[PDB]
Design a protein around this ligand. Structure first.
Ligand code: ZN
Lengths: 199, 148, 78, 105, 49
């Protein structure tokens, strides 16, 4: 009796797989047909064959879904900062403090090339740098660290090490990763959408 | 001398969570003179360790006690005298994380350093003064010997 | 001045390699010394690595105006 | 109107005079102002110069923009006539904002 | 032709046709579907079209 009931449940899986065949294909065929025409122009707009404007800038950001490291975001800041620290341990440069970090970050961001980048991304970076800067403040405070660098048990300066070379590398890496993560003009933006939803 | 840190410990507990592997144990230790606490893993097939042992360990920058720092290569078949001659169990590893004992809101003067011996973890914790010289990414040797 | 993106889009790379391979298939002069490879696509890839291909892209904006970039001044990437 | 209005006056409500026009709202609709609803992004009307500058920026012909129906509840709210343009500021998933323009037909 | 008793050659069914559009290639699908399937030439009179 158990074997019979077990079979009754099992056959439903086989029946479902048989039924799936046709309907899904029909949906996909209709959908890709409807969307196939669109494309991403060199102006960053997306236009139908007639030349009308569908979106003024693909996706609001212009980014490309197939080039995202974070959860629907182009970057995951703390992971990048961590990577740059390990790749470039700079035992020579002195440890930076809140004021020094904020001053040096502002000076680097002043360069015109970063001004060419998107505003939103710049704001988020500023926020992240503020965040780490306040965190190091707590750490340097609790342990009685001195900003002049003269504290005796020098191991205490390893707690939140960060140095100007590392800051500059991080900012360059951030800018490049953002910049190269855009929807290359001429992509077939429609077909990618129909295929992704259909699957 | 290239010694970074040296002290006598005593073992306190072996497997707080019970047996996990067939060749490794998670020692919990405490230090006699200073009040460091240690977590260490040893290959108990070759260096078996009992629940009551006492031992001295030294963490050193180099095995050439004369002070030579030619760390270009290491040859297992070497025979010239070296600091390894005075110990019974030697490992090689890297210090890969240093952090503060955040549990203390005030009088925060205790640190924790992690040394990873190619899979076999260790953590050494206590007052800041005794931990001078431990640096991230530095490579160090661990030497150990049992005492009666 | 020029407004478009300064990198080379994958589509531009594809069509440049294709048309240069076709040009070298017929007996065109080769602009870089070859060590003995006899496959047009690999010669064209080497030429592009040396950035010597004699091809000028013409990017048509939607309205009808255009912009010209030499294949040596686009930032080629991976 | 409370509940409705007669069909002959429905017909008359389009041809009283070229110089005169009338606009009818339902009591039921007016009970709530859609502008405050959570699912309605802010709409803004702009002067002809603004549309001139916009069409100059993207190099567009006016009939290329996305459309908005005349009978749209918001279009009725603003009482805008055919051929005007409307700016929209969609609240992003984040602090950002996306601007898009729609034409009234 | 179609069969295996007769000679064959497989089908580029419409799903593949979308796949090839998807990547953004253009000569590849032209080649696969016109040069190597039923390439043919005709003539027309421009005056009468
Ligand atoms: Zn004719």
């Amino acid at each position: 009796t158990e074997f019979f009931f077990h079979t009754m449940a099992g056959r439903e899986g086989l029946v479902d797989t048989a039924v799936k065949t046709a309907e899904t294909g029909y949906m996909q065929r209709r959908l890709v047909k409807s969307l196939e025409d669109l494309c991403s122009q060199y102006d960053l707009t997306v236009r139908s064959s007639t030349g009308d404007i569908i979106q003024f800038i693909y996706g609001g950001d212009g980014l490309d879904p197939a080039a995202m490291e974070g959860k629907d975001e182009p970057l995951e800041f703390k992971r990048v900062l961590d990577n740059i620290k390990a790749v470039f341990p700079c035992p020579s440069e002195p440890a930076l403090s809140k004021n020094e970090l904020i001053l040096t970050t502002e000076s680097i961001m002043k360069k015109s090339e970063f001004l060419c980048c998107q505003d939103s991304f710049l704001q988020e970076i500023k926020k992240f740098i503020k965040g780490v800067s306040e965190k190091i403040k707590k750490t340097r405070d609790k342990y009685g660290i001195n900003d002049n660098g003269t504290t005796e048990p020098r191991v205490l300066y390893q707690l939140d090490r960060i140095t100007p070379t590392q800051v500059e590398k991080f900012l360059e890496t951030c800018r490049d990763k953002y910049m190269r993560a855009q929807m290359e003009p001429g992509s077939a933006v429609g077909a990618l959408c129909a295929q992704s939803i259909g699957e | 001398a290239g010694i970074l840190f040296e002290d006598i410990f005593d073992v306190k507990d072996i497997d707080p969570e019970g047996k996990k592997f067939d060749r490794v144990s998670r020692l919990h230790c405490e230090s006699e003179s200073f009040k460091m606490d240690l977590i260490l893993d040893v290959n108990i097939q070759i260096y078996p360790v009992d629940l009551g042992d006492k031992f001295r360990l030294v963490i050193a920058s180099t095995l050439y006690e004369d002070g030579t720092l030619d760390d270009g290569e290491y040859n297992p078949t070497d025979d010239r005298p070296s600091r390894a001659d005075q110990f019974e169990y030697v490992m090689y590893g890297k210090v890969y994380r240093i952090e503060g004992d955040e549990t203390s809101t005030e009088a925060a003067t205790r640190l924790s350093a992690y040394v990873s011996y190619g899979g076999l973890l260790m953590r050494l914790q206590g007052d800041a003064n005794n931990l001078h010289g431990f640096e991230v990414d530095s490579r160090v040797y661990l030497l150990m010997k049992k005492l009666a | 001045k020029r407004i478009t993106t300064p990198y080379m889009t994958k589509y531009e790379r594809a069509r440049v390699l294709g048309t240069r391979a076709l040009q070298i298939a017929m007996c065109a002069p080769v602009m870089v010394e070859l060590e003995g490879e006899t496959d047009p696509l690999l010669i064209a890839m080497k030429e592009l690595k040396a950035r010597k291909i004699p091809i000028i892209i013409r990017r048509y904006l939607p309205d009808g105006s255009y912009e010209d970039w030499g294949v040596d001044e686009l930032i080629i990437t991976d | 109107v409370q509940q409705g209005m007669t069909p002959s006056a429905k017909q008359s409500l389009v041809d009283m005079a070229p110089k005169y026009i009338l606009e009818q709202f339902l009591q039921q609709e007016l009970l709530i102002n859609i502008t405050e609803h959570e699912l309605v992004p802010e709409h803004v009307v702009m002067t002809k110069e603004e549309v001139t500058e916009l069409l100059a920026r993207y190099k567009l012909r006016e009939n290329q923009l996305p459309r908005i129906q005349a009978g749209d509840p918001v279009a009725r709210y603003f009482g805008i006539k055919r051929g005007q343009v409307v700016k929209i500021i969609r609240p992003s998933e984040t602090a950002g904002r996306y601007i898009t323009y729609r034409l009234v037909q | 032709t179609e069969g295996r008793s007769r000679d064959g050659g497989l089908r580029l069914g419409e799903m593949e046709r979308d796949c090839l559009i998807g990547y953004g290639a253009s000569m590849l699908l032209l080649e696969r579907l016109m040069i190597s399937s039923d390439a043919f030439e005709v003539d027309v009179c421009g005056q009468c079209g």
